[PDB]
Amino acid sequence: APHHWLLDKLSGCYAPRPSAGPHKLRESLPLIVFLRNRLKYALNGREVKAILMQRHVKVDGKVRTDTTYPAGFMDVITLDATNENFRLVYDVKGRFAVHRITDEEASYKLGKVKKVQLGKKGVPYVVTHDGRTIRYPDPNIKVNDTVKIDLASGKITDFIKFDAGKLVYVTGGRNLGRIGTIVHKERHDGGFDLVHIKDSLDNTFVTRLNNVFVIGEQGKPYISLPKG
Amino acid sequence: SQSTLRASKKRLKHRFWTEVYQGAKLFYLSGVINGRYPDREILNLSRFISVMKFRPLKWRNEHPYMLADRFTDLTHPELIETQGLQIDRKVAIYGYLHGTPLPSAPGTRVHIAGVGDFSVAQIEKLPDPCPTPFRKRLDDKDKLIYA
Amino acid sequence: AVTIRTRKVISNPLLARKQFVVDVLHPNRANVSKDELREKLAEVYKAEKDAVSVFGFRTQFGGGKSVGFGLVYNSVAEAKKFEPTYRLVR
RNA sequence: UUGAUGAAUAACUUUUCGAAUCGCAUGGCCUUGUGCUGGCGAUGGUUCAUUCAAAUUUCUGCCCUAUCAACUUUCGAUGGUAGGAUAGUGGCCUACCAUGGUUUCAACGGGUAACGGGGAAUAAGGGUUCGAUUCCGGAGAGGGAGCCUGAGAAACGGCUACCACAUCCAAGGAAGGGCAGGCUUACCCAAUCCUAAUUCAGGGAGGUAGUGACAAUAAAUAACGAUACAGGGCCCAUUCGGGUCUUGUAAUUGGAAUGAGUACAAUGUAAAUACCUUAACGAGGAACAAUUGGAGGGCAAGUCUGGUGCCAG
RNA sequence: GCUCAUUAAAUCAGUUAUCGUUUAUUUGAUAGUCAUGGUAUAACUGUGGUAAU
């Protein structure tokens, strides 16, 4: 069992494996861990099945009926009961954190582009980290930038180019998952670019450029970070 | 209750081992439920009597003995009708010999248990009706009774 | 008779049910015989007995008390839909 | 300087697809035929991306050793180019072309009992550093060799020979691959996870109970009281002797407690078994009747042996 | 799935690189160029052979 699920070692031998999906499997949190295990909505594994078939839960504007469905970082998980909307966000200590958001904030998500090329018949396209490929983006949108997604359609309402001095979340590596808003961008052999980070206590931290997820300007983040 | 049953089990092993125990092994039959027993208990019975490896004993290796398979009287009914059920009957008996070689000169004296001291009159061996065969299973044609 | 205390009354509207931990006090008797609680946990509410489901009763040692978990549904036809089959037979 | 723009032709193909697919809405025009037209989906299907993979690959990090100083080109070693093969890189393979590679910074070679090692992974809230779990590495399914499907196998729960076993035959043929034990083939799919078209069905995955007391632990086999009758009981001492006292009873007798069993329910569980809880019973000695081991005397119209009576053994 | 025979830059561990590749399933994008053609498996009906499938 991985670290970031907050499961106990107790209650049963085998760990619930993730399904293949949009997110990476080691980055994923399955919905069985999301409902009965951390949010404590269900008790048995079969009780997760009754919730999914009745279509209570919707993840990122889709029905999303699967027990081991992979949910990852920055995923709007809308539950039709209680009129409450949930957004997954990683916690500094090594784990995931379920977070309350608003209806307007459940409309948009942010997404890191991983690769951009020129599609067929002369069409630009960007590929997000959640695998949402979008036709005709802004040519300003280039590699490692975030993308604000409409989720009513697949359209792009805001875009933030990668420039030094903007509030960055880390997705990967040792120092994974903090604020720290940038020091600069380092070059190294093999790429291995180390986009440096100085936190609220102004301490240098080093992860890869692959792990960099721009969650806002210096000052404003675009989403409601959980305060605690 | 198993706990009163299991306590009665070790009371019967530790009784039985005071008298017989060479490694002695008694086990538990389930029930007569349909005129018959479950096949696992019959297998474990037929296993345990197949690994028994008998020792020879002191009386059995000094005295030729046999068990009578089938009993046959060989008298004329005209001897019976004349003499009128008073005769001592000429009797042929059938069995497997054991122990030591019963000498084939007719006239050795030999004792029926519970009748009296008799003597043999005429001897004749035969092919046995249940032969041992001549690391495989037995074919079911070859397992064979004689009753 | 018996007396019941309810702790952690937690409402789960996904299954449309009221969950709570049940704290059953046995002054002298022996035990509480769960059918009698499904009577008494019903009439503390509106439940019309078979929309309640009590299962997790392990006794306080030495008697006197037992602690477990109670599931009170809404809409009694939902008890056929979300409960397991081994609690329908009880 | 500030911004702002740029950086299909021509052919081919054992012609692939361009839907003889399904569900809700039933509407619109006129020549009124059951005509013409028309919404929202769903499923395919091409390509792309995504993930589950798999394949190579980059880099850094293994134990002993100079009584191994050269190693490799002695199955290509180093590389060039061209072709092939493959999912693809590629001396992978082969032509042709150059003589290189690694090395005292230890190459290469040897030893490794490499049951030793990996924070691979929690672990032990004082057992001082304990545990369990996972990972070894390779090969095989009687032995060789060749093949076929499939995303995946160079698959033994496939085919073809060969070599060797071995079974049925009516003698014409047909058919087949050791494993536990010696010097439970029980119940169950709830929990757990998995599988699926998927609440359902299923898993000898998984859990439950049986034969398996070795060893080790906390109880019980009795509490309490009255009356009677006797005068003696114990301690020390080598001998004589001394010391001290409410002690003794194969004695009657009264109630009061109780679990070892026996025995309803409830709880538990998927269902049980068991524990837990709990009614109903359940103690007077021939009982609801624990043993092993040591010390010591005594008895007969007894027996035996010895003896200088009746004694000694 | 079980069983037999011991590997020192190999395995393994992490790390890339896949613009070097293939991918069923997962997800996200994406196609304007006859009220019904033509075949086809059997089951079955009945006859037999063969020690036998």
Swiss-Prot record, chain A:
Residue list for modification Phosphothreonine: T102
GO MF assignments: RNA binding; rRNA binding; structural constituent of ribosome
One annotated GO biological process: cytoplasmic translation
CDD domains (alphabetical): KOW_RPS4, S4
A Pfam match: 40S_S4_C
Subcellular location field: Cytoplasm
Positions where Phosphoserine occurs in the chain: S19
UniProt-listed InterPro entries: KOW, Rib_uL2_dom2, Ribosomal_eS4, Ribosomal_eS4_C, Ribosomal_eS4_central_region, Ribosomal_eS4_central_sf, Ribosomal_eS4_KOW, Ribosomal_eS4_N
SMART domains: S4 (SM00363)
Segments forming domain S4 RNA-binding: 29-92
Superkingdom in the source lineage: Eukaryota
GO cellular component: 90S preribosome; cytoplasm; cytosol; cytosolic small ribosomal subunit
Cross-link (Glycyl lysine isopeptide (Lys-Gly) (interchain with G-Cter in ubiquitin)) at residue(s): K49, K121, K148, K155, K161, K166, K198, K220
Main location: cytoplasm
Keywords: Cytoplasm, Isopeptide bond, Phosphoprotein, Ribonucleoprotein, Ribosomal protein, RNA-binding, rRNA-binding, Ubl conjugation
Function: Component of the ribosome, a large ribonucleoprotein complex responsible for the synthesis of proteins in the cell. The small ribosomal subunit (SSU) binds messenger RNAs (mRNAs) and translates the encoded message by selecting cognate aminoacyl-transfer RNA (tRNA) molecules. The large subunit (LSU) contains the ribosomal catalytic site termed the peptidyl transferase center (PTC), which catalyzes the formation of peptide bonds, thereby polymerizing the amino acids delivered by tRNAs into a polypeptide chain.
Protein family membership: Belongs to the eukaryotic ribosomal protein eS4 family.
Subunit structure: Component of the small ribosomal subunit (SSU). Mature yeast ribosomes consist of a small (40S) and a large (60S) subunit. The 40S small subunit contains 1 molecule of ribosomal RNA (18S rRNA) and 33 different proteins (encoded by 57 genes). The large 60S subunit contains 3 rRNA molecules (25S, 5.8S and 5S rRNA) and 46 different proteins (encoded by 81 genes).
Miscellaneous field: Present with 573 molecules/cell in log phase SD medium. There are 2 genes for eS4 in yeast.
Protein name: Small ribosomal subunit protein eS4A
Organism: Saccharomyces cerevisiae (strain ATCC 204508 / S288c) (Baker's yeast)
Curated annotation (Swiss-Prot), chain B:
Signal peptide bounds: none
Region G5, residue ranges: 29-38
Paired cysteines (S-S): none
Record localization: Cytoplasm; Nucleus, Nucleolus
The organism's place on the tree of life at top rank: Eukaryota
Main function: GTPase required for synthesis of 40S ribosomal subunits and for processing the 35S pre-rRNA at sites A0, A1, and A2. Controls access of pre-ribosomal RNA intermediates to RCL1 during ribosome biogenesis by binding of RCL1 in a GTP-dependent manner and, via its affinity to U3 snoRNA, delivering it to pre-ribosomes. GTP-binding and/or GTP hydrolysis may induce conformational rearrangements within the BMS1-RCL1 complex allowing the interaction of RCL1 with its RNA substrate. Required for RCL1 import into the nucleus.
Subunit note: Interacts directly with RCL1 and the U3 snoRNA to form a stable subcomplex. Component of the 90S small subunit processome also known as 90S pre-ribosome that consists of the 35S pre-rRNA, early-associating ribosomal proteins most of which are part of the small ribosomal subunit, the U3 snoRNA and associated proteins.
Family per record: Belongs to the TRAFAC class translation factor GTPase superfamily. Bms1-like GTPase family. BMS1 subfamily.
Protein name per its UniProtKB record: Ribosome biogenesis protein BMS1
Swiss-Prot record, chain C:
Keyword set includes Secreted: no
Source organism, top-level taxon: Eukaryota
Keywords from the UniProt entry: Acetylation, Cytoplasm, Isopeptide bond, Phosphoprotein, Ribonucleoprotein, Ribosomal protein, Ubl conjugation
Disulfide-bonded cysteines: none
Residues modified as Phosphoserine: S11, S53
GO molecular function list: structural constituent of ribosome
Single GO BP term: maturation of SSU-rRNA from tricistronic rRNA transcript (SSU-rRNA, 5.8S rRNA, LSU-rRNA)
Cell compartments where the protein resides: Cytoplasm
Post-translational modifications: N-terminally acetylated by acetyltransferase NatA. Also partially acetylated by NatC.
Gene Ontology cellular component list: cytosol; cytosolic small ribosomal subunit; mitochondrion
Main localization (coarse): cytoplasm
Glycyl lysine isopeptide (Lys-Gly) (interchain with G-Cter in ubiquitin) cross-link, renumbered residues: K18
Family: Belongs to the eukaryotic ribosomal protein eS24 family.
Subunit structure comment from the entry: Component of the small ribosomal subunit (SSU). Mature yeast ribosomes consist of a small (40S) and a large (60S) subunit. The 40S small subunit contains 1 molecule of ribosomal RNA (18S rRNA) and 33 different proteins (encoded by 57 genes). The large 60S subunit contains 3 rRNA molecules (25S, 5.8S and 5S rRNA) and 46 different proteins (encoded by 81 genes).
Other remarks in the entry: There are 2 genes for eS24 in yeast.
Function: Component of the ribosome, a large ribonucleoprotein complex responsible for the synthesis of proteins in the cell. The small ribosomal subunit (SSU) binds messenger RNAs (mRNAs) and translates the encoded message by selecting cognate aminoacyl-transfer RNA (tRNA) molecules. The large subunit (LSU) contains the ribosomal catalytic site termed the peptidyl transferase center (PTC), which catalyzes the formation of peptide bonds, thereby polymerizing the amino acids delivered by tRNAs into a polypeptide chain.
Protein name: Small ribosomal subunit protein eS24A
Organism: Saccharomyces cerevisiae (strain ATCC 204508 / S288c)
Part of the intact protein present: 4 to 93 of 135
